[PDB]
From Swiss-Prot:
It comes from the Eukaryota. Belongs to the SNF2/RAD54 helicase family. SWR1 subfamily. It comes from Saccharomyces cerevisiae (strain ATCC 204508 / S288c) (Baker's yeast). This is Helicase SWR1. Catalytic component of the SWR1 complex which mediates the ATP-dependent exchange of histone H2A for the H2A variant HZT1 leading to transcriptional regulation of selected genes by chromatin remodeling. Component of the SWR1 chromatin-remodeling complex composed of at least ACT1, ARP4, RVB1, RVB2, ARP6, YAF9, VPS71, VPS72, SWC3, SWC4, SWC5, SWC7 and SWR1, and perhaps BDF1. Present with 656 molecules/cell in log phase SD medium. It is found in: Nucleus. Disulfide bonds: none annotated.
C-alpha cells in the first residue's frame, strides 16, 4: 500500500480555491486562499 492521492480527495483538497477563484481575479491577488493553495501545490508537486 503506497497510495498517494485520490481523485475525489483531490477535489476535496482545497476545492473551490483552485477552480473558481481564478475567474474572479479580485481574490487571487488578495491572497485570502489562492496564495496558500498555490504554495501548497508548489510544495507537493515540484518534487514530482
Amino acid at each position: 500500500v503506497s497510495g498517494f492521492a485520490d481523485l475525489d480527495a483531490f477535489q476535496q483538497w482545497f476545492g473551490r480555491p483552485v477552480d473558481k477563484i481564478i475567474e474572479t481575479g479580485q481574490n487571487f491577488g488578495q491572497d485570502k486562499e489562492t496564495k496558500k493553495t498555490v504554495a501548497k501545490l508548489h510544495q507537493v508537486l515540484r518534487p514530482y
